[PDB]
Ligand binder design. Structure first.
Ligand SMILES: C[C@@H]1O[C@@H](O)[C@H](O[C@H]2OC(C(=O)O)=C[C@H](O)[C@H]2O)[C@H](O)[C@H]1O
Length: 363
């Protein structure tokens, strides 16, 4: 029941399930594998087991050639996320192929379309729409690159993107942030007055809090946002925990509507909150009192969402598949999948930040 034990169990199950050539979407550079591999590389640093490092490197090498060339969806913030695996790979090998690949992804920022205030469109196919998920897809990578190449322009970039998102999607009443915002107000889900989508979808908010929790330490010392983001995170975590499931300790697909019978407890979102809370506590951004909420979620997660198959495979169920911006009925109707990379990555990542607290609990 130690966090890392489950993390390795799930990691090995996924790796045994897919060769790096099969890791879905097969032979594509995408954030599905990106988040899972970020988890795998984090587990590597925590255990020192070379095969976690080698598996991640295998996927990178399948897509990045001898000259650092990489094929990717050029209009999506989503394409940048996997770039996060390039930093630990480069730091360990010093192979310039990874820095060259990272530069191709970093060069995308200047080619992307933006809203009138400068917020990146989530994709070319989603004109003038900012989705919370985008903060994680393009934020952390930008800061990691900023520190690697001493390009301060990227600090301002992330600060702007984050402020624009919070400004347009944060709900005063609940403290939760709406999934998406359409400056053009052309999408059917765009509120005629605010331009926001109608629901608080767990994972989207989860991507946001994990981002804040990880990006604070990347900012230069004394940076104005070290305090802005810490405070934003405290308020969001406070808001989020107000909706934790009293019985299971988990969170619902649609955060603020757990009473509805068509709603349900979703795994990846819960894990992302667990990660942000654990991370926040370890870095001193959140009151250590949150440890109980965290350990309660861990208990419910393992108890209600995990099991081992007759064959010995560790399974995490109720992970929502890739999802777009929409209405309530669309969100609750999303396919629930077992070991979907969205959830596997979130699960493993959460276990790596949880472990430390788990071992110092009571001290
Ligand atoms: C190409 C597919 O586009 C969407 O269906 C999904 O990606 C979106 O949803 C999510 C998510 O966390 O569910 C994250 C991305 O930021 C967003 O673009 C699929 O995952 C994509 O494969």
């Amino acid at each position: 029941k130690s966090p890392l034990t489950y993390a390795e169990a799930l990691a090995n199950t996924i790796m045994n399930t897919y060769t790096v050539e099969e890791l879905p979407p097969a032979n594509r550079w995408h954030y599905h594998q990106g988040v899972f591999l970020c988890g795998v590389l984090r587990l590597w640093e925590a255990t020192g087991e070379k095969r976690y490092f080698e598996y991640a490197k295998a996927y990178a090498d399948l897509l990045i050639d001898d000259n650092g060339n990489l094929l990717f969806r050029r209009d999506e913030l989503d394409a940048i996320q996997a770039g996060l695996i390039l930093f630990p790979l480069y730091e360990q090998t010093k192979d310039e192929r990874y820095v060259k690949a990272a530069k191709r992804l970093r060069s995308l920022y200047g080619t992307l379309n933006r809203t009138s205030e400068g917020g990146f469109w989530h994709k070319d196919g989603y004109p003038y729409q900012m989705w919370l998920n985008g903060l994680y897809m393009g934020g952390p990578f930008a800061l990691k690159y900023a520190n690697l190449k001493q390009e301060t322009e990227l600090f301002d970039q992330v600060v702007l993107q984050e402020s624009l998102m919070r400004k347009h999607t944060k709900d005063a009443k609940t403290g939760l942030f709406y999934h998406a915002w359409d400056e053009a107000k052309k999408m059917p889900w765009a509120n005629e007055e605010t331009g926001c989508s109608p629901e608080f979808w767990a994972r989207s908010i989860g991507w946001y809090v994990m981002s804040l929790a990880d990006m604070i330490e990347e900012l230069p010392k004394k940076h104005p946002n070290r305090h802005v983001w810490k405070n934003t995170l405290q308020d969001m975590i406070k808001s989020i925990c107000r909706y934790q499931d009293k019985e299971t300790g988990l969170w619902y697909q649609i955060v603020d509507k757990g009473d509805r019978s068509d709603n349900w407890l979703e795994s990846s979102g819960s894990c992302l909150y667990m990660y942000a809370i654990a991370k926040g506590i370890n870095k001193g951004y959140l009151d250590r009192a949150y440890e109980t909420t965290l350990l309660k979620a861990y208990q419910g997660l393992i108890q209600h969402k995990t099991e081992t198959s007759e064959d010995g495979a560790f399974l995490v169920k109720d992970i929502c598949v890739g999802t777009s911006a929409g209405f309530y009925d669309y969100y609750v109707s999303r396919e629930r999948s077992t070991n979907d990379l969205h959830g596997a990555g979130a699960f493993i990542l959460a276990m790596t930040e949880l472990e430390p607290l788990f071992r110092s609990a009571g001290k």
